[PDB]
Scaffold this active site. Structure first.
Site, PDB file in Angstrom:
ATOM      1  N   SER A 198       0.847  -1.197   0.000  1.00  0.00           N
ATOM      2  CA  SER A 198       0.000   0.000   0.000  1.00  0.00           C
ATOM      3  C   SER A 198       0.883   1.249   0.000  1.00  0.00           C
ATOM      4  O   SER A 198       1.761   1.320  -0.859  1.00  0.00           O
ATOM      5  CB  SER A 198      -0.998  -0.036   1.164  1.00  0.00           C
ATOM      6  OG  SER A 198      -1.889   1.062   1.081  1.00  0.00           O
TER       7      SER A 198
ATOM      8  N   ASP B 296      -5.377  -3.946  -2.888  1.00  0.00           N
ATOM      9  CA  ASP B 296      -4.319  -3.685  -1.892  1.00  0.00           C
ATOM     10  C   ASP B 296      -3.614  -4.952  -1.394  1.00  0.00           C
ATOM     11  O   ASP B 296      -4.285  -5.942  -1.106  1.00  0.00           O
ATOM     12  CB  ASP B 296      -4.990  -3.012  -0.685  1.00  0.00           C
ATOM     13  CG  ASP B 296      -4.106  -2.257   0.281  1.00  0.00           C
ATOM     14  OD1 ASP B 296      -3.197  -2.885   0.881  1.00  0.00           O
ATOM     15  OD2 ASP B 296      -4.402  -1.074   0.544  1.00  0.00           O
TER      16      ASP B 296
END
Length: 359
Positions: free
Chosen positions: A54, A192
């Site tokens: 991320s 993610d």
């Protein structure tokens, strides 16, 4: 032998809280620049592997992607300014009834502007950037070392960078295509890296390094799991255990899917930090090399600082402060050594190893 040691940097996910590890990396890169009398010294000149999930993966891309001069795109001191300038625009609510909180348009546009048409094969170091593919139902980990057997994984840095940060309910999943060895199209449907259970990707990063040790002679010292020869810096974006921000089983008995979705990712990311740190501490302690593994983590986030998407000016300033205060905090209880001191020691080891290899 210091010279043969393998160096790995790993940065946790956590949205806007990416300001905390960026503040730590600003301090570390500044120390290396000072010690080596080189104002252009960069983290990628000292680390063999840089892993991130991320915003940690976004940071990895910025410090490992080459510019026109084949030097890292961003200095560590330019990351906190990037968050202050672009964070409010990345985390600007779309207000749409259906779909995620953010449309992800600004996030893609800034990644495209900063990274250009660069691809993972051009990375200045080994990179480990995580994602989960919702179509193949598997984790998809972007690296340089696996491009020999999987050239389809030579994706654009902005596609990888958006994907690693595309948190479900926050940003829309990303679709992009690459080409296989025989010219066939290869698609990615990504969310993610936290969804792949690696909000803390430090163990994944050292596993990639261990796999490289079987084929790359520069990584040979850590073949046979000799982590006495590995130096690992793992940076967190903070967790919380204060009762004002946590829950009871009693109140959660009537929670619907909507309430569980708002908290499930914060819980799993905290778990990934505790679990990964536990696996690594076990490994380095078993080889009596505990001080080769430096985990820089904030344990008591309070107030607005707990929210991944709060890019208000005041919250970002509080995040710089928790990072600056983290430098002055002890590495553990019973150990007065501060994070600043342990990072100065780590900087010295990185500088000495680079010098010895140049000989």
């Amino acid at each position: 032998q210091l010279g043969e040691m393998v160096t790995v940097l790993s940065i946790d996910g956590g949205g806007i809280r990416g300001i905390i590890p960026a503040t730590i990396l600003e301090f570390l890169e500044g120390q290396l620049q000072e010690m080596d009398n080189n104002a252009d010294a960069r983290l990628a000149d000292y680390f063999d592997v840089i892993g991130g999930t991320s915003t940690g993966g976004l940071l990895t891309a910025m410090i490992s992607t080459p510019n026109e001069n084949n030097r890292p795109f961003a200095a560590a001191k330019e990351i906190v300014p990037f968050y202050f300038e672009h964070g409010p625009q990345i985390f600007n609510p779309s207000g749409q009834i259906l779909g995620p909180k953010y449309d992800g348009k600004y996030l893609m546009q800034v990644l495209q502007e900063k990274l250009g048409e660069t691809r993972v094969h051009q990375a200045l170091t080994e990179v480990v950037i995580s994602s989960f593919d919702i179509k193949t139902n598997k984790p998809v980990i972007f690296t340089k070392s696996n491009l020999a057997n999987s050239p389809e994984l030579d994706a654009k840095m902005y596609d990888i960078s958006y994907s690693t940060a595309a948190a479900p309910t926050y940003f829309p999943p990303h679709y992009f295509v690459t080409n296989t060895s025989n010219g066939d199209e290869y698609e990615f449907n990504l969310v993610d890296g936290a969804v792949a259970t690696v909000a803390d990707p430090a163990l994944l990063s050292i596993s990639v390094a261990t796999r490289l040790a079987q084929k790359d002679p520069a990584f040979a010292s850590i073949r046979s799991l000799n982590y006495k020869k590995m130096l690992l810096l793992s940076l967190g974006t903070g967790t919380t255990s204060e009762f004002d921000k946590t829950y009871t089983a009693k109140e959660a008995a009537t929670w619907t899917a909507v309430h569980w979705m708002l908290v499930i990712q914060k819980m799993t990311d905290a778990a990934s930090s505790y679990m990964t740190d536990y696996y690594l501490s076990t490994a380095f302690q078993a080889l009596d090399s505990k001080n080769n593994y430096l985990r820089v983590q904030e344990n008591a986030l309070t107030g607005t600082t707990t929210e991944m998407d709060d890019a208000s000016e005041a919250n970002m300033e509080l995040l710089v402060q928790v990072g600056e205060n983290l430098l002055k905090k002890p590495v553990s209880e019973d150990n007065p050594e501060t994070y600043e001191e342990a990072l100065k020691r780590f900087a010295k080891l990185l500088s000495d190893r680079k010098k010895l290899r140049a000989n």
